[PDB]
Amino acid sequence: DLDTHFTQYKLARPYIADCPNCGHSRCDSPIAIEEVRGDAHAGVIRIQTSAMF
Amino acid sequence: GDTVTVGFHDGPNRHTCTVAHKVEFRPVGREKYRHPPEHGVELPCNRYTHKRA
């Protein structure tokens, strides 16, 4: 579908926040990780980042 | 990990060397880690500085 993608893109936009990537000591990135989820038996995980894909 | 390796390219070569040598991740305070989290209490630690000279 494309319509649902439009409703996703109708008003959403990326944003910038902080992540504790300690390779660079609390950097602020567009790719800010938020609440990764994994409970599937097969070992799959989905992650909800801070950038539009 | 267990074996430390370092490698850099020049274009024909990968120039990699390896040393079998134990490496450890020592947690401060009283709670074991996998990596220190974003928030919590502060403690006095010791580590190698990052100044040129």
From Swiss-Prot, chain A:
Cystine crosslinks: 22-27
Positions in coiled-coil regions: none
Record membrane topology: Single-pass type I membrane protein
Residues represented out of the complete protein: 323 to 375 of 1239
Species this chain originates from: Eastern equine encephalitis virus (EEEV)
Localization: Virion membrane; Host cell membrane
Domain of life of the native organism: Viruses
Function: Plays a role in viral attachment to target host cell, by binding to the cell receptors VLDLR or LRP8/APOER2. Synthesized as a p62 precursor which is processed by furin at the cell membrane just before virion budding, giving rise to E2-E1 heterodimer. The p62-E1 heterodimer is stable, whereas E2-E1 is unstable and dissociate at low pH. p62 is processed at the last step, presumably to avoid E1 fusion activation before its final export to cell surface.
Modifications made to the protein after synthesis: Palmitoylated via thioester bonds. These palmitoylations may induce disruption of the C-terminus transmembrane. This would result in the reorientation of E2 C-terminus from lumenal to cytoplasmic side. N-glycosylated.
Quaternary structure and interacting proteins, as annotated: Interacts with spike glycoprotein E1. Processing of the precursor of protein E3/E2 into E2 and E3 results in a heterodimer of the spike glycoproteins E2 and E1. Spike at virion surface are constituted of a trimer of E2-E1 heterodimers. Interacts with 6K protein. E2-E1 heterodimers interact with host VLDLR or LRP8/APOER2 to mediate viral entry. Interacts (via E2-A) with host VLDLR (via class A repeats); this interaction mediates viral entry into host cell. Interacts with host LRP8/APOER2 (via class A repeats); this interaction mediates viral entry into host cell.
Protein name: Spike glycoprotein E2
